[PDB]
């Protein structure tokens, strides 16, 4: 048996951040990784046609200080996603160019409903503790309804309900009827709320890494050398003896003081446990699926949309569109002109039936109509990745909680099981679902183990992160009118009173 | 490597039924069972205090002809669950004795609401094909709603909503807000409707096996001998080569022409596949949890409830009661007097934190109140099983579908993956979730392999079952008034 202090299961950003912190603290770590590569839900493809492209996790932004610090220490740089020209909101077959993070509306009644929808998501968010969403005062009531039921109660206009539906689909790669209202409200609040999560400039989608996000996991692998074991899927964890035994699919045995599970929670199911998991984790890892997404990148000779004063951002409502959201994916140098689009939730299932060529054709025709541009029909190259296919991911971007599960099972997500500690973005309390959350969770799990070993006091398990000097965070602000304009039901109450 | 015609993964009723059919046709079968026992979600414990007790699946009834034929061939007999005396509905702190399958109501508005709720479950089921619930005309509408939403829409009275909620909790060991309305309506319809699924006399709970349901899987293991490998959890399936390779956790390798997966769908996640599973199956097996239940049996010196003209059936509304439903578990001789109770769904999760003795005390004080008898406070023995604990079940009774999953992934459940065919009660089209469904799905999956081998024609894969001579089904009837009384909003539209 190969002996060490800590086995880390999974060489994603979370596992690799954990392994590096333990290695830096002078412990002997092994990383057991299922795939022939590190990075997990991050994957940077390199070829002559694209140079490099993120097929998984890509965007970082302000308030994501841990992934920024980690990446800067490994010698990586960021650049800004193109948001110089106009965004497009495409609704009912027509494109409406706009500026600012929120797609605007002119109908006064529709304006009240839209303003009240975003405001109410944040209002409800402020009731939900980041580190214990089940302690929200109405946790039970909100967890026992889907986001569909919540939008049916909140949205007094089809226009707000359609944009709200797209917001859920895009943010968590799941249908409104699939997800807990409590869990979704938590997810948005723990990323800093509606404006921060939806924004390119000043939000989640502001930046990409020069050379791709896969470099984070690769460069930590370089520092760890042969401590990373590729094509070692873990099958078996035994805690009945003094040292934890960890067995891989190729029959290798690792022996450790402690284990970090840095895999998506449900992929816990791929491991046979001795003794059996406690009841609540046993059931929790069968109740927490990952969302569905195809990330598609169409290449063009030039970023032609910019010549029409379009930045490349498209927000596209409704059923017929294969893609509901795009960003400019052009290199910072201005070359390898490209549009990144997501095929979301049920469409990732429905359209997987097509060939790569048939999906490229549908995306080109959509982009031609939305951009009013025949050049969109002249792609030079295409890359895509259906994350629904991945045995060792289960989906992307992250784990969603169906109705009733977060209040019954949420406590056990990062609860240690004897000498097993839980990392993975899903166990984060800030930007859970993101690369940021992966770094928070890996470092926190590593420090739980350092605490258990008596190397650090308890108050060092959770540590705040200094703000990036490279990517300073502009605060989120509201106007007086945004704060106090009535809802549609509010307005009707005012009317009736008069 | 150990070579055979078919490896069956799982030695529950479904895997054993499949293995027996294939063995009987002259194929060399191996059954790989993760546990040190067969039976899976069935488990019969024997000791001097109980003689025998079903701690998992127990009840069989009319229209369940496959489990009744298989058990009969294995030498098993049934006896009737005691329903001679009165059932009890305990509502707002008081016991209301009754007869007939449906707890009655006296308020005329509440009466319209109750009548409408049961009738509407069956009306909606009539449009849901048993073999394809996703082809229901309103499949997407019904799938994108929870049973909580449907009950909030349908039930104008708290009385009807409390009993409908208990119905869902009892039937599928899950909360109304956890489950798809489409999936739940399918589940009821594919057991023959509300009356058939809730009934003791002439329904699903009519009978038990003399000596326990465990004997079904045990006696098929007896027939198959050392073709059954106990403590062989399957970890890896490789279909890249000429023969399928199946590896176990103890590093044994089995080589076969075909595989039957006879495990709960989600427990497919415990197996690493080469090549990877197709996308839709890869995601489906992360979306399909099993429900939560503690099955509890309190033993008494005598079936004392019978002295008060109670049969031992208790229907107990509300949050406070640990147990919402009981049946008499007394043996047919009138000895080993016992009450079987279920601790359902969230209560299985909440009350798991207590000790065994603390659960016994709560159950005995509840039974004392409902049965109005101090004798309930004097148990002679207790047995219980928390099915939430089981690494190789994931829960009980069966797999539930959360909103949106059945329409998007339902077609995947019995779709073959190269030379892997799918058994398990979850894949049945009649009494899916039951021992009956297990037999249906095991035999159908075995016959899919006999067809792939050219041994039987396509039209023999699915096979009707002659009706049991021992347990014949009596028709389900309704009254003129049940069919035609208006709903509450019906009565309001008239006013
Ligand atoms: C898929 C995706 C996700 C994503 C995104 C777009 C797509 C298409 N966009 C993002 C974005 O722009 N910005 C961002 O910050 N996040 C974005 N995401 C999410 C992001 O990729 C993830 O949150 C993050 O990468 C997750 O990191 P974590 O380290 O927690 O998880 P992982 O990447 O899944 O790594 C787990 C590793 O474990 C291995 N594995 C699995 N099972 C085993 C077993 N049994 N034994 C050993 N190793 C195992 C996996 O192979 C993986 O490497
Ligand atoms: C738990 C339970 C279920 C139940 C019930 C009450 C409770 C508390 N009441 C029932 C009732 O009164 N009447 C009835 O008809 N059903 C009732 N049920 C449900 C019933 O028990 C089940 O529907 C039925 O037993 C299901 O059988 P099936 O054969 O489909 O599935 P299983 O019993 O779970 O068997 C699966 C076997 O596979 C083994 N396993 C699991 N993973 C592996 C791996 N990786 N490798 C090898 N073997 C594996 C399991 O150990 C099990 O033996
Ligand atoms: C008069 C009926 C209006 C329905 C409006 N919607 C938005 C559909 C529901 C509001 C629910 S709530 O009334 O705010 O609870
Ligand atoms: C009154 N409840 C029963 C709450 C809703 C009526 C159902 S409906 O939605 O109005 O038909
Ligand atoms: O929540 C998000 C966007 C919401 C939104 C944007 C524009 C208009 C309305 C909603 C959003 C969240 C995450 C991602 C990521 F991580 F995958 F890249 C992309 C987008
Ligand atoms: O649906 C069931 C009973 C429903 C019911 C009975 C009386 C009043 C209201 C609902 C019911 C379903 C299954 C089981 C079993 F086989 F798992 F034990 C037991 C009971």
Residue numbers in the entry:
A (entry chain A): 2 to 499
B (entry chain B): 2 to 496
Passage from the reporting paper:
In this latter field, monoamine oxidases (MAOs) play an important role, being mitochondrial and flavin adenine dinucleotide (FAD) cofactor-dependent enzymes, which catalyze the oxidative deamination of monoamine neurotransmitters. In particular, the MAO-B isoform is mainly investigated for treatments of neurodegenerative disorders (including Parkinson’s and Alzheimer’s diseases), while the MAO-A isoform mostly deals with neurological and psychiatric disorders. In this connection, although a number of MAO-A and MAO-B inhibitors are already available in clinical practice, the need to reduce their side effects and/or to improve their selectivity is still definitely of interest and encourages studies aimed at developing novel types of inhibitors. The two binding modes in MAO-B are likely due to the peculiar morphology of this isoform, which is composed of two similar subcavities separated by the Ile199 and Tyr326 side chains.
To this aim, the binding modes of 13 and 14 in MAO-B were studied by X-ray crystallography. The three-dimensional structures of human MAO-B in complex with 13 and 14 were solved at 2.3 and 2.1 Å resolution, respectively (statistics are reported in Table S3).
